[PDB]
Design an enzyme around this catalytic site. Structure first.
Site, short mmCIF file in Angstrom:
data_model
loop_
_atom_site.label_atom_id
_atom_site.label_comp_id
_atom_site.label_asym_id
_atom_site.label_seq_id
_atom_site.Cartn_x
_atom_site.Cartn_y
_atom_site.Cartn_z
N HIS A 1 53.15 51.99 42.60
CA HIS A 1 52.04 52.09 41.47
C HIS A 1 50.89 52.25 41.86
O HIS A 1 49.92 52.79 41.29
CB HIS A 1 52.19 50.76 40.75
N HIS B 1 43.18 47.83 45.43
CA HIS B 1 44.04 48.92 45.17
C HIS B 1 43.33 49.94 44.42
O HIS B 1 42.22 49.59 44.00
CB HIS B 1 45.43 48.57 44.49
N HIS C 1 43.19 53.22 41.29
CA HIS C 1 43.61 54.23 40.27
C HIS C 1 43.10 55.53 40.18
O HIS C 1 41.70 55.61 40.64
CB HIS C 1 43.49 53.67 38.87
N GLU D 1 40.10 53.73 35.12
CA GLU D 1 40.52 53.16 34.06
C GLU D 1 39.46 52.74 32.95
O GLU D 1 39.54 53.17 31.89
CB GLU D 1 41.37 51.76 34.34
N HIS E 1 39.83 48.40 42.70
CA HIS E 1 40.00 47.04 42.01
C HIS E 1 39.96 46.10 43.29
O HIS E 1 40.92 45.98 43.98
CB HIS E 1 41.13 47.04 41.32
N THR F 1 45.65 45.33 34.24
CA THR F 1 45.71 46.48 33.83
C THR F 1 47.26 47.12 33.88
O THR F 1 47.33 48.31 33.33
CB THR F 1 44.69 47.76 34.05
N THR F 2 47.96 46.35 34.36
CA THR F 2 49.33 46.73 34.66
C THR F 2 50.28 45.42 34.19
O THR F 2 49.68 44.26 34.08
CB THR F 2 49.84 47.16 36.07
N1 LIG Z 1 44.70 46.81 37.86
S1 LIG Z 1 44.24 45.28 38.01
O1 LIG Z 1 43.99 44.72 36.87
O2 LIG Z 1 43.28 44.84 38.93
C1 LIG Z 1 45.84 44.37 38.66
C2 LIG Z 1 45.84 43.47 39.52
C3 LIG Z 1 46.80 42.92 40.03
C4 LIG Z 1 48.09 43.36 39.54
N2 LIG Z 1 49.18 42.54 39.90
C5 LIG Z 1 49.39 41.76 40.98
O3 LIG Z 1 48.43 41.37 41.69
C6 LIG Z 1 51.00 41.31 41.23
N3 LIG Z 1 51.26 40.11 40.56
C7 LIG Z 1 51.28 40.11 39.05
C8 LIG Z 1 51.66 38.54 38.63
N4 LIG Z 1 52.71 38.16 39.09
C9 LIG Z 1 53.03 36.74 38.56
C10 LIG Z 1 53.20 36.55 36.98
C11 LIG Z 1 53.86 37.44 36.27
C12 LIG Z 1 54.07 37.34 34.87
C13 LIG Z 1 53.16 36.32 34.14
C14 LIG Z 1 52.13 36.09 34.98
C15 LIG Z 1 51.94 35.81 36.16
C16 LIG Z 1 54.20 36.14 39.27
C17 LIG Z 1 54.30 34.87 39.28
C18 LIG Z 1 55.33 34.08 39.91
C19 LIG Z 1 56.44 34.95 40.30
C20 LIG Z 1 56.48 36.24 40.04
C21 LIG Z 1 55.35 36.87 39.55
C22 LIG Z 1 52.54 37.98 40.43
C23 LIG Z 1 52.37 39.19 41.13
C24 LIG Z 1 48.14 44.14 38.30
C25 LIG Z 1 46.88 44.61 37.94
ZN LIG Z 2 43.91 47.90 39.20
#
Ligand SMILES: NS(=O)(=O)c1ccc(NC(=O)CN2CCN(C(c3ccccc3)c3ccccc3)CC2)cc1
Ligand SMILES: [Zn+2]
Length: 258
Positions: free
Chosen positions: A60, A90, A92, A102, A115, A195-196
Site C-alpha cells: 500500500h 510512510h 502517498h 491526500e 505521514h 486514510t486507509t
Molecule cells: N494514512 S494514515 O492515516 O497515516 C494511516 C496510518 C496507519 C495505518 N495503518 C496502520 O498503522 C496499521 N494498523 C491499522 C489498525 N490495526 C488495528 C485495528 C483494526 C481495525 C480497527 C481498529 C484497529 C488492529 C488491531 C488488532 C489486530 C489487528 C489490527 C492495526 C494495524 C493506516 C493509515
Molecule cells: Zn498515510
C-alpha cells in the site's frame, strides 16, 4: 482493498462503513476558513537519531517502522494533551507530478505527502488499541514538492530498490525522521481518521504548513515501487492516496494567521 479501479477508495465503504463517517480524512484545507488558535502549545517533534528498524513495501506504501518501547521519539504540544510515540512513517504519491498528496490546500495537491504516525502509548496498551480511540493517534503530515535534491531523503531513495516488490522488507537503522521535517512548525489541525482501512476515526491530524522538497529523481524512485508481489504482473505503486472527504462541520485550526 487497494487503490485499483475495482478496490479503490470510492468502494472502500462496501467493506468499511465508517468510510462514510463524520470525521474521515483526508480533507481539503480552506486556509481562509481555518481558525487561528493561539491557545495551542508549541508543536514539538523530539526525534532521536537511531530508533528506526526497517523499511517495508506492504503493498500500500513503503513504511519505515520504529522502536516505540519508550518515549524518546514523540510528538508533543500543539493540540495534543500528552506525548505520542512514533510508530512508523510512510508516503502517498501520484503517477504525475500534479497529484499524490491526500490533503489539499485550497484545492491544491502536492506530488507527495509524508505521514508520521504516533500513538498514545501513555494511556493505551497497544497501537491497535489506541487506533480505535478518538484520542488514540496523532499523525503529522508533511507535504512534499519537487525541487532541489533532499540530502537525507537519499538514504530512503537508495533503499527503495530492495523493497520494490510487495511484501518485502529490509533493515533500516539510524534514520532520523527529523531530517524529513521543514524548518517551520506551523500547522493546521483537525479531528480525523486513518486514510486507509480500517479508516478508524482515532486521529488527531497535524498537517505542517511548510512542505519539504525532494528532487524529481528522488520522487521517481517512489514510482518505481510496485503494488504487485515478486511473481505477479508488475503494477507500479502510484496514486496510493485517498481523495478529500466531507468536512461535516469540523473545525480546522491553524497555529498561524494566513
Ligand atoms: N494514512 S494514515 O492515516 O497515516 C494511516 C496510518 C496507519 C495505518 N495503518 C496502520 O498503522 C496499521 N494498523 C491499522 C489498525 N490495526 C488495528 C485495528 C483494526 C481495525 C480497527 C481498529 C484497529 C488492529 C488491531 C488488532 C489486530 C489487528 C489490527 C492495526 C494495524 C493506516 C493509515
Ligand atoms: Zn498515510
Amino acid at each position: 482493498w487497494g487503490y485499483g479501479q475495482d478496490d479503490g477508495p470510492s468502494h472502500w465503504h462496501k467493506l468499511y462503513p465508517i468510510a462514510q463517517g463524520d470525521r474521515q480524512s483526508p480533507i481539503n484545507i480552506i486556509s481562509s476558513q481555518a481558525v487561528y488558535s493561539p491557545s495551542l502549545q508549541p508543536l514539538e517533534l523530539s526525534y532521536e537519531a537511531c530508533m528506526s528498524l526497517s523499511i517495508t513495501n506492504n503493498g500500500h506504501s513503503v513504511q519505515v517502522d520504529f522502536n516505540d518501547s519508550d518515549d524518546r521519539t514523540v510528538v508533543t504540544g500543539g493540540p495534543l494533551e500528552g506525548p505520542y510515540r512514533l510508530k512508523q512513517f510512510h508516503f502517498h504519491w501520484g503517477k504525475k507530478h500534479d497529484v499524490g498528496s491526500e490533503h489539499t490546500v485550497d484545492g491544491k495537491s502536492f506530488p507527495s505527502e509524508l505521514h508520521l504516525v504516533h500513538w498514545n502509548a501513555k494511556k493505551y496498551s497497544t497501537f491497535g488499541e489506541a487506533a480505535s480511540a478518538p484520542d488514540g493517534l496523532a499523525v503529522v503530515g508533511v507535504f512534499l514538492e519537487t525541487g532541489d535534491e533532499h540530502p537525507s531523503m537519499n538514504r530512503l531513495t537508495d533503499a527503495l530498490y530492495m523493497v520494490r516488490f510487495k511484501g518485502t522488507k529490509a533493515q533500516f537503522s539510524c534514520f532520523n525522521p527529523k531530517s524529513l521535517l521543514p524548518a517551520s512548525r506551523h500547522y493546521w489541525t483537525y479531528p480525523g481518521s486513518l486514510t486507509t482501512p480500517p479508516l478508524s476515526e482515532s486521529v488527531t491530524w497535524i498537517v505542517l504548513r511548510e512542505p519539504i522538497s525532494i528532487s524529481e529523481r528522488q520522487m521517481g524512485k517512489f514510482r518505481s515501487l510496485l503494488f504487485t508481489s515478486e511473481d505477479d504482473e508488475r503494477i507500479h505503486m502510484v496514486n496510493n492516496f485517498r481523495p478529500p472527504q466531507p468536512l461535516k462541520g469540523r473545525v480546522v485550526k491553524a497555529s498561524f494567521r494566513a
